[PDB]
């Protein structure tokens with residue numbers, strides 16, 4: 001087997017999600033911030049390129065407003081080194097940006113996703129990556145969601161994050177812990193991916 | 209102003225009904241019936257109808273080329289259509305002419321029906337939004353299956369609800385088939401939610 005050639009992308013780790021008005025609720029945000037930092041430190045030690053993504057909305061916007069505290073990168077990011085930076089104003093870190101080219105220029109075959117939110121920025125970015133031919137990894141303990149209620153119904157942060165983690169594992173990404181990822185980097189091994197048939201069979205077999 | 213819609217009917221194949229990937233929520237007869245209604249309402253209004261069929265290789269457990277499971281369900285195979293694409297990844301854009309065909313017909317709004325909510329439908333919607341299309345998702349003309357894998361468990365109800373709520377928060381106007389039919393007959397758009405509102409309504413359940 002070929003050794004995975006990973007890039008770690010740290011998506012929208014900004015104060016809005018922590019001290020601001022879109023507070024991450026599951027996993028616990030302090031626990032995911034700590035794992036983001038471990039993943040970044042491990043990546044730097046192992047020579048895995050680290051890409052920071054920052055999301056902006058216009059000045060005066062209620063969230064992620066240019067010039068506001070909430071739009072600034074959290075100290076976990078800002079006090080660390082990085083190898084690349086991408087600003088975005090859409091969920092996906094690829095659309096219209098230099099990300100795909102930058103990755104390709106570094107022979108990246110595997111994009112390891114951390115940051116926020118699981119169901120929006122992270123999932124959009126992963127969807128683009130998968131359909132471009134990249135393998136994707138998702139660190140379930142270095143990511144997270146918020147609860148939502150709207151005309152379509154209610155879903156908690158735990159339900160959103162779990163659903164997305166399980167769906168990702170079924171088809172789109174290797175879902176793993178930060179500890180698991182760090183070890184796989186050390187060993188030069190891929191992380192395990194699930195599949196739709198196994199995933200649905202297991203749930204059905206249990207219901208039986 | 210009046211949307212220029214196309215209705216896309218994704219992967220309404222026997223695998224999901226009589227085969228080995230049975231849709232569990234919403235009830236599959238109820239969503240098949242609504243897909244039928246939506247197609248007929250589109251037809252009557254001159255809204256174009258696009259059919260998508262997903263194939264895996266001959267001999268695969270699901271969607272195998274040559275198998276009954278891979279065939280379109282008669283609800284859809286016996287009806288009129290304006291366009292057809294076959295695909296082999298979740299998004300109906302990747303490796304198909306879909307974006308080109310929609311562009312040639314000056315489509316600005318894509319209405320999504322068919323299966324699965326969290327896989328083919330979500331991936332198609334995420335591509336469409338990022339290409340600049342407006343998207344609608346008919347929550348009673350779509351559906352999910354349960355999954356269990358190394359990332360955890362989630363039921364079909366949880367998966368469909370979580371994706372319906374997340375889509376309403378940012379990616380699509382989520383509506384019932386009746387609401388869509390009324391919007392087509394009236395030449396009006398459907399309502400979209402937003403992330404900040406969705407999160408604020410959920411946070412109010414704490415009742416501090």
Ligand SMILES: [Cl-]
Nearest residue numbers: 193194357358
């Ligand atoms: Cl698995």
